[PDB]
């Protein structure tokens, strides 16, 4: 047994290598700018009726 | 046996059934080659 503070299962769970040292100019990323850029890219790359009605290379020549 | 009637819910259910039938038809007709199945795996 050994008389530990934790239970054996708790000892196994919390002795994993992930529990190492676990003891209880300037800029911030611009999410808005990247959202606007993604919207612009989507615009630059391209209702009630049913679906069954509506539907009815840079490696081309390498040295090898 | 169900003795109840709906005005637009019946039409919506009919539309959903037709959509499911068409989707299953498309999937079955496109799964005739194993290449589509392999592509769907990485899809």
């Amino acid at each position: 047994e050994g008389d530990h503070k934790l239970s054996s299962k708790a000892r196994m769970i919390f002795n994993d290598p992930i529990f190492n040292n676990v003891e209880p100019f300037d800029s911030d990323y611009d999410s808005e700018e990247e959202k606007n850029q993604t919207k612009k890219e989507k615009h630059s790359r391209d209702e009630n009726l049913p679906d069954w009605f509506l539907e009815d290379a840079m490696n081309a020549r390498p040295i090898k | 046996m169900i003795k109840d009637k709906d005005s637009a819910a019946d039409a919506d259910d009919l539309e959903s059934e037709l959509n499911a039938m068409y989707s299953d038809y498309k999937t079955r007709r496109s799964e005739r080659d194993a290449k589509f199945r392999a592509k769907q795996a990485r899809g």
Partner: peptide
């Protein structure tokens, strides 16, 4: 599976025109 065999073509078409 293929459950569409529960509806014949004429029934399916006449219900598609309903939509």
């Amino acid at each position: 599976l293929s459950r569409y065999v529960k509806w014949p073509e004429y029934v399916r078409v006449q219900r598609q025109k309903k939509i």
